[PDB]
Amino acid sequence: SELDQLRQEAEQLKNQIRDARKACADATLSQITNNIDPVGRIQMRTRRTLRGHLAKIYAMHWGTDSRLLVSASQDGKLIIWDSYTTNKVHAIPLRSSWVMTCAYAPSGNYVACGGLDNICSIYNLKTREGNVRVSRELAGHTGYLSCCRFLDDNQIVTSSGDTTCALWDIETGQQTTTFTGHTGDVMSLSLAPDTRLFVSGACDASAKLWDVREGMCRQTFTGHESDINAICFFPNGNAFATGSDDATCRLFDLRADQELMTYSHDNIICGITSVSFSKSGRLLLAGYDDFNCNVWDALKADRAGVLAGHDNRVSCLGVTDDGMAVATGSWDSFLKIWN
Amino acid sequence: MGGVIKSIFTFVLIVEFIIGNLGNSFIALVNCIDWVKGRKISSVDRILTALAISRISLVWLIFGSWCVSVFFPALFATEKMFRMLTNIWTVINHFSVWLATGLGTFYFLKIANFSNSIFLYLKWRVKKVVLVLLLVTSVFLFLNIALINIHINASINGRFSSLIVLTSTVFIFIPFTLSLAMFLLLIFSMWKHRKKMQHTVKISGDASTKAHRGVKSVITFFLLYAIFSLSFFISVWTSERLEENLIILSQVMGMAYPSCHSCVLILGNKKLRQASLSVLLWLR
C-alpha cells in the first residue's frame, strides 16, 4: 500500500522530470553546429614511448607542470616519468600489486593509488630522506577503489565499487563526506575545474553530479545502456562526457540536464575505457578496447583521427594542462606520448 | 653405372636445393611479415630466423659451388677457389650447426625439470648460456680452420678430400652429439614427470592439452635423427672405403641437414604450422 504509493510517486516524478527535460529540448547540437567548419584530419604521431613497466598499465595521471606523469601497473610499481627526456624519476613499490587507479597531486608533493585492497595509499615524494614513503593508508571502503582525485594536499575524493564515493581528510585519515546515491559500482571520477562539484559514472548506466561541500547529488544522467567506465568534464565545467561499454560516448549538459550528442560508429562494437577532452574542448579523445584510440569532433560527432599503435587494450589516457601532448597507456605495458 | 649414379645424385641435389630454399625462405619470410606487421617476436623465433638465414647462405654456397664446377671446371680446378670455398663453407657451417645446438639448449633449459643446482643456474640464465655457448665454441672453429688449412697445405705440397671430409664430419659430430644428449635428457625429464603425474595426481579430468601435442614433434624429430645418423654412417663408410665420385655425393650430403631440418622445424612450431595452414588455405 504505502510502498505502492511511493512507487507511484516515484514514477510520477520520473515522468515529470522527463517532460521537463523534453520541454527544454527545442533544438539539437547536431543541427546547430551543422554550419560550422569541420576539422579535417588530426594526424598525431608517437613522440616518446615510455618503457619499464612489466605488466598491464591500469592508470596514468598527468602533472600540473605538463611534464611529470605517474603510472600504475599490476607489477606493484608506481613510476613517475619525465616525459620530455623519457627517464624515470621515482619507482614506488606498492604493498598491494592490485592497483586500479593513480592520482597526481596538483602541488606535485603527493601521489595516490588504490585497488583491490580497498585502501587509498598516499605517498610523500618530497621527503628529507631520498625515498618515497607512505604518508597515509585511508581504509574505510568496502569494495575496490576505482578512481581517486586530489582536491588539494589534504583532501582526496575516491570512487569505490561498494556503491559509494567518499571525500577524505588526509591528516586525520577519516572520511568527511560519503556520497551514497548510486546502485551499481562506481567506476570513474572527474573533478570540475573550480573544484567544487564532481561527476561519477557507475555500473547502473548512470552519472551523478555531486556537490563536495553539501554532500548531496544534484543531477542524474540516464542515457547509456551499459556500464560507464570513463567520465571527464568539459574545460568549461558546464558539460561532461561519458564512456560506456555499449561502444558509445555521450555528451551531457549540466544546465539542460540531458544528452546533447552521441559519439557512436557502426564499426565499433567494443567499450570505452578512457575519455579525455582537448584544451579547447573541440576534440574528444576516447580510448577503446579495439586496441586503439579514436579522436572525435565534440561539436559534430565525426571521427577526426585514430591513435593506432597499441598492441592491447588502451586502458588509460590523459591530455596535459597546456594541451600539448596526449599520453595513452595500454595493457601491453607501454605509455606513448602523442602530439 | 657411374653416369646414371651421378645423374641420380644430381637430381637429388636439385630436389634438396629446392626444398631447402623453400623451407628456409618460408621461415625467414614468415618471421619478416610478422615483424613488419606489428606483432611480437619470441626468442625462439629469433633463433629460428637466424638458422633460416644461415641455411639459405649454406645451401646457396653449395649450389653455387656445383654450378661453378659443372659450368667452369677450369675455374674449379684452381687452388684459390678451392681454399676460399672450403674456408667459407666451414665458417658458415660451424655457425649454422652451433646455432641449431643453441636452439636445442634453449629448449632443454626452458622445458626440462631437474633438481640439480648447476642445472637451475643454467636454467635461469638461458640467454647468457646460449650466447656463451656460441662464443666459447669458436675455439672449435679456429682449430677446424687450422687443421683444414694444414691438410690443404699438405695436399698441395705432396685436394686430399678423403681427410678434408673426415675432419669436417668429425667437427659436425660434436654439436650433433650434444643436441642428441640434450634431447634424450629432455625425454627422460618428461617421462619422469609423466610417471609422477600418473600415480600421485589422477592424470587429468580433461586430458587434452599435455605432451599429447608434443609427441608429434618428438616423433618427427626422432625420425630425422635416425634417418640422419644412418646417412652419417653411410657417408663416412663410403668416403673411407673406395669412392672416386666424392664431390657430387659430398655436395649432396652437405645440403641434407639445412634442407630437411628446416622442414622438421616447420612441423613443430605452432606459428610455422599456422602459417603453413594459412598458405594452403589461401592458395586454394
Partner: protein, 220 residues
Amino acid sequence: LSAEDKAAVERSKMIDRNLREDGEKAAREVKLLLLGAGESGKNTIVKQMKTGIVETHFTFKDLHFKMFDVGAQRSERKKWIHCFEGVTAIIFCVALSDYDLVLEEMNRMHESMKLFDSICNNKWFTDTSIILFLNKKDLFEEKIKKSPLTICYPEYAGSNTYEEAAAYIQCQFEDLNKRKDTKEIYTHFTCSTDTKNVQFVFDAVTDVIIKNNLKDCGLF
C-alpha cells in the same frame, strides 16, 4: 646533456636495473587465485597450506607461492576478473558435503556448478588451468548413507556408495569444461585431518609450468 641531466640518466638506469631484477624475481613466483563458495570451506585450505583481498605466501620445495583470496570482494566480479588474466592456476574449492543443503532457488552444489561454469568458460581464463578440491569427504561419507544423491542430481541412477557418488560429482564438475582443449582440470579429494594438499598443488603447478614452458618455446 648537462651534468645533472647525465646524473638523472644514471638514476633512471639504476631504476631500470632494479625493475628488471624485480621482474625476473617475480616471474619465477607462482600466482594462485583461490575461489569457492561461502560454505564450501577455504579457511581450512589456507590453514593447511600455511575486507579487500588476502595474499598468502608460502614456500614449498624451492617454489614461492602467492595465493590470492577474493572471496571477501562483494562487488561485480566482471569488473576485476581481468586483473587475474595472467595467473598460473585457479584453485576452486567445492565442499561435497552440501549436496543435500540449500543456500531456496538453487542448491549449494548447483551454485558451485554455476560459479564453476562462469569461471572456467570466462574469456580471460581460456588457457588457465583449474585445480579442484573436493573438501569434506568424511561428512560426505557419513551423509551418503542416510540421504541419497538423487536430491541434488535427480538423473543419477547409480550405486549409493561413497566412491561412485564421488566419481559422479567429479564428472559433473568436469563436464562443464566447454573449452576442453587448451586447459586442464586437476581434481583432489581432501579432508580436514589430512596434510597432503600442498603436494597436490605442487604437482599440478609443475605440470602447468611444463605446459607454459612448452607454449613459450612454440611447441604447442
